[PDB]
Design a protein around this ligand. Structure first.
Ligand SMILES: *[C@@H]1O[C@H](CO)[C@@H](O)[C@H](O)[C@H]1NC(C)=O
Lengths: 51, 247, 49, 638
């Protein structure tokens, strides 16, 4: 019964180091069971937090 | 719902390992053979190969015959090779649809395993209904806790509303005891009579293994390996014949 | 078991479930090798992430 | 004076059929007795008798079968003395016997296994005619370390060549490349191998292939290298997902990766379009010159993740060559000796630099002009060059005159050719040149017998005797008269199914060299046939292709084959081919095994007639004292 928001994913795709597929965008609240995120780099010095 | 409907269980990686004899009278050197075989429950492509051993012509392998097996709506349950006891694990139940123009609203369930700890219980069972637009793929994540070591069973069944189309998949996975599989060499010995023995006959004692930090409720495996060491020696090829060309 | 030169260099494996002392008798003429290894699970469970 | 000679294969195998040829140059009914007795010493194996026929010009269509002996056994290898006597004179020669009594084709149901399953395998025991035979076999199963874990010994008596065995994989076992080594009981050095994986895996749900638009790579590309992604399900459908692509360089026993060329692409409906730029490749290494990359190949590693994040398919197209010229020339099937005066045809094999044959590509010569050809499906072109009649060696290279391309992209390679040592400076040669076409069973090949003698004694060559050597045996023999005034004759040979994969057509005839003295002029030419089955085994469906098969349904398979043949079936998923497509049984593998075990490696036309027959794999001996050399190994040097 849960699904991630669309505008947040749009903002993430707008920003660097974050990529969400276009096919995920036109995948509205009816079906968003699983999500996929790709990170360009992972920071080892500190913790990279995304919400 | 999922009680009078059978599932798919036979998923071998190689079958039809059979032999056949061509005994029909020849028709310009070609014999026709009509044989009934049953394709496996797996939904994939089968590379059927044939090798003929004739007593007059010779051996011959046929160009690989590819058989494509298809369904307009099915389920694939993807599992790792092995799991570890008393841990949280997540598995993928993909639903594939290849009907070009039809919206699907399907009910999916998995039967409980007494050797597994999921939300599935003898009374409280999974009851979820999902929606698939035509020509797309889905994915259901499932949470499980392995309890006892062994080859266990995973059941999944799916039924589409307003159509007489159903599917089921049974898969087998290994459950491994927690910890690192290690191999503590108990003993290595050289066996040699009349050198370390007492007048031919010998007797050597192997103490029990330490096993101080063994995980309880597990069974171990003691392998005794025997081997013969070649003592190949001298007396190789003698003098060459070149020196004998004068006698 | 019998070890012959022609049939040597073969993995003769004897499997045991119980941890107990063993007694081997090496007779005849020649040499040989023997290895006893217990494969098991140990409670050295560290963090795996 | 009556003249006699022996024709025998260079190597004969135990428990088989061998054929020798006798010729009389002595009309009249004369019997011949051939005796095979072991060597060294004089201990008898076999003896045969046959009377010649004057009306047939005395061909030797005489055969023998070597006994299935048991005391032949360690130490150095063994020879056999073969003797012939046509009543009044004795001729004997030494021949080599082979422990390679046949071939063992070990075929497993899969390529990769799990701990806790069963390896199923079939040993196909054939002989050098690729025919079922009954022998005893010793089988070993070796662990990845190299020590057997199981051994067995079976017999193939009245089993029609199929030896089905099985093995159980323990649940507590070592992972890696497991081996099966089977050899005939009589031949401990005839080890046949089959390596299969043992791994902890799970079936992939789709096959991904990474294919280049241009299958090679060029240094001076101003656009880059384009590779496309075809990720299709194993049942032939289209995917929707993402992929990660990285590159590298295949140096000597190492792999260098380029994290800069680590790209991510959306697989849009089973399709991708990845472009590797030249700047990234240049920055990957620290070489000031790009030309130093010639001689090394790239590899593309792709990994496609579905939108469900379920499967994990890592596919690699290793070996993308970087070459200045996209065409490479070979001299594999071309002889290393040239014929002065006689036109010396060259078998030109021009291919993509990774072995795949080219097509519609010509060949050019530095000095010769207006001469060009075209490449057929197999990948062989043709040319004709007249040679210097003197003893000057010929060294030539093959150039390409392909259009829409630069003149600096034409490959070259110096080839060394040696003159033939004609006995007595007679300038008499032989050329069994054949027109290069697609040879199929049931067709007719117009084999040409090119001739170049002198008018002084050209009319004294009454007939030509031709011999066919296939799989190291005298397949057939024949004669063709040569009346005076003819310089070319055509033999419309009906090529049957017994000429696969190839046949050495050697020809011989007698001669007198300038004073009452016996000589033999002979030559052979390599001829290859399109590699289809000797028999006709095909598999299909007895239905009418109405609709797709459905899981759990039956289909009535149709198998077409010979009569009296034993056909074995294996149905295996293509997911194992996804995980490991290595070591698969194919008819091309069988023919390559035969060719590697064939008695000939050089095309022919050696330094002398003895060298000619050594290349052709023959032993000729006569009362005049002429004899050839001998060879003791099994495979050709280098
Ligand atoms: C024990 O297993 C490890 C692999 O986990 C291997 O490297 C090692 O050689 C093995 N030792 C013995 C004695 O079997």
């Amino acid at each position: 019964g849960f699904a991630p928001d669309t505008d947040d994913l749009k903002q993430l795709a707008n920003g660097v180091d974050r990529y969400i597929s276009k096919y995920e965008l036109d995948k509205a609240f009816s079906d968003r069971n699983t999500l996929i995120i790709y990170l360009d780099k992972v920071s080892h010095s500190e913790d990279d937090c995304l919400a | 719902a999922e009680e009078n409907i059978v599932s798919r269980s036979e998923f071998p990686e190689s079958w039809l390992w059979n032999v056949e004899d061509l005994k029909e009278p020849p028709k310009n050197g070609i014999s026709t053979k009509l044989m009934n075989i049953f394709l496996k429950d797996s939904i994939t492509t089968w590379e059927i190969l044939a090798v003929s051993m004739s007593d007059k012509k010779g051996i011959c392998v046929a160009d690989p015959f590819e058989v494509t097996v298809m369904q307009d709506f099915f389920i694939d349950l993807r599992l790792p090779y092995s799991v570890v006891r008393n841990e949280q694990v997540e598995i993928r139940a993909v639903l594939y649809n290849y009907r070009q123009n039809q919206e699907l609203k399907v009910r999916v369930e998995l039967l409980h395993n007494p050797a597994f700890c999921s939300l599935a219980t003898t009374k409280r069972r999974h009851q979820q209904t999902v929606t698939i637009p035509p020509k797309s793929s889905l994915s259901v994540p499932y949470v499980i806790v392995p309890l006892k070591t062994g080859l266990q069973e995973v059941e999944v069944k799916a039924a589409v509303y307003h159509h007489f189309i159903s599917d089921g998949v049974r898969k087998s996975l290994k459950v491994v005891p927690e910890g690192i599989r290690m191999n503590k060499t108990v003993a290595v010995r050289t066996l040699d009579p009349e050198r370390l023995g007492r007048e031919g006959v010998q007797k050597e004692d192997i103490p029990p293994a330490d096993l101080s930090d063994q995980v309880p409720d597990t069974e171990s495996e003691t392998r005794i390996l025997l081997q013969g060491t070649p003592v190949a020696q001298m007396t190789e090829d003698a003098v060459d014949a070149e020196r004998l060309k004068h006698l | 078991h019998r070890i012959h030169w022609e049939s040597a260099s073969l993995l003769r494996s004897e499997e045991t479930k119980e941890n107990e002392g063993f007694t081997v008798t090496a007779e005849g003429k020649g040499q040989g090798t023997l290895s006893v290894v217990t494969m098991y699970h140990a409670k050295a469970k560290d963090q795996t992430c | 004076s009556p003249m006699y000679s022996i024709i025998t294969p260079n190597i004969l195998r135990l428990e088989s059929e061998e054929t020798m040829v006798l010729e009389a140059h002595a009309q009249g009914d004369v019997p011949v007795t051939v005796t095979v007795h072991d060597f060294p010493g004089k201990k008898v194996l076999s003896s045969e008798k046959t009377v010649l026929t004057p009306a047939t010009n005395h061909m030797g269509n005489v055969t023998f079968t070597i006994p299935a002996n048991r005391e032949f056994k360690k130490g150095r290898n063994k020879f056999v003395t073969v003797q012939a006597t046509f009543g009044t004179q004795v001729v004997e020669k030494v021949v080599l016997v082979s422990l390679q009594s046949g071939y063992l084709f070990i075929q497993t149901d899969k390529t990769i296994y799990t701990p806790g399953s069963t390896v199923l395998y079939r040993i196909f025991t054939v002989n050098h005619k690729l025919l079922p035979v009954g022998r005893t076999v010793m089988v070993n199963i070796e662990n990845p370390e190299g020590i057997p874990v199981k051994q067995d010994s079976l017999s193939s008596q009245n089993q029609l060549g199929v030896l089905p065995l099985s093995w159980d994989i323990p649940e507590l076992v070592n992972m890696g490349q497991w081996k099966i080594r089977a050899y005939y009981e009589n031949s401990p050095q005839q080890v046949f191998s089959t390596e299969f994986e043992v791994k902890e895996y799970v079936l992939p749900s789709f096959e991904v292939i990474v294919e280049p638009t241009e299958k090679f790579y060029y240094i001076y590309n101003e656009k880059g290298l384009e590779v496309t992604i075809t990720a299709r399900f194993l049942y032939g459908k289209k995917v929707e997902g993402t992929a990660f692509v990285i590159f590298g360089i295949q140096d000597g026993e190492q792999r260098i990766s380029l994290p800069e060329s680590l790209k991510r692409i959306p697989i849009e409906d089973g399709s991708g379009e990845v472009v590797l730029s030249r700047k990234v490749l240049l920055d990957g290494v620290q070489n000031p010159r790009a030309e130093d990359l010639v001689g090394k190949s790239l590899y593309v590693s792709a990994t496609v993740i579905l939108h469900s994040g379920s499967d994990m398919v890592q596919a690699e197209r290793s070996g993308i060559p970087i070459v200045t010229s996209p065409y490479q020339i070979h001299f594999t099937k071309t002889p290393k000796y040239f014929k002065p005066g006689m036109p010396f045809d060259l078998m030109v094999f021009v291919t993509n630099p990774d072995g795949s044959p080219a097509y519609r590509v010509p060949v050019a010569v530095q000095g010769e002009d207006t001469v060009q050809s075209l490449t057929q499906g197999d990948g062989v072109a043709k040319l004709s060059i007249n040679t210097h009649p003197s003893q000057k060696p010929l060294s030539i290279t093959v150039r390409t005159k392909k259009q829409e391309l630069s003149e600096a992209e034409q490959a070259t390679r110096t080839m060394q050719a040696l003159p033939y040592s004609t006995v007595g400076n007679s300038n008499n040669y032989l050329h069994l040149s054949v027109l290069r076409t697609e040879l199929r069973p049931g067709e007719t090949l117009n084999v040409n017998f090119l001739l170049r003698m002198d008018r002084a004694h050209e009319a004294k060559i009454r007939y030509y005797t031709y011999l066919i050597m296939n799989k190291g045996r005298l397949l057939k023999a024949g004669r063709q008269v040569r009346e005076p005034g003819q310089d070319l004759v055509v033999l419309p040979l009906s090529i049957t199914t017994d000429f696969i994969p190839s046949f050495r057509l050697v020809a011989y005839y007698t001669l007198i060299g300038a004073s009452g003295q016996r000589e033999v002029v002979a030559d052979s030419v390599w001829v290859d046939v399109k590699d289809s089955c000797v028999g006709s085994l095909v598999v299909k469906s007895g239905q009418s292709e109405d609709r797709q098969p459905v899981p759990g349904q039956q289909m009535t398979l149709k198998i077409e084959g010979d009569h009296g043949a034993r056909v074995v079936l294996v149905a295996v998923d293509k997911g194992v081919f996804v995980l490991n497509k290595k070591n698969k049984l194919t008819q091309s593998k069988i023919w390559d095994v035969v060719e590697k075990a064939d008695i000939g490696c050089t095309p022919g036309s050696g330094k002398d007639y003895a060298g000619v027959f050594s290349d052709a794999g023959l032993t000729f001996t006569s009362s005049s004292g002429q004899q050839t050399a001998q060879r003791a190994e099994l495979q050709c040097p280098q």
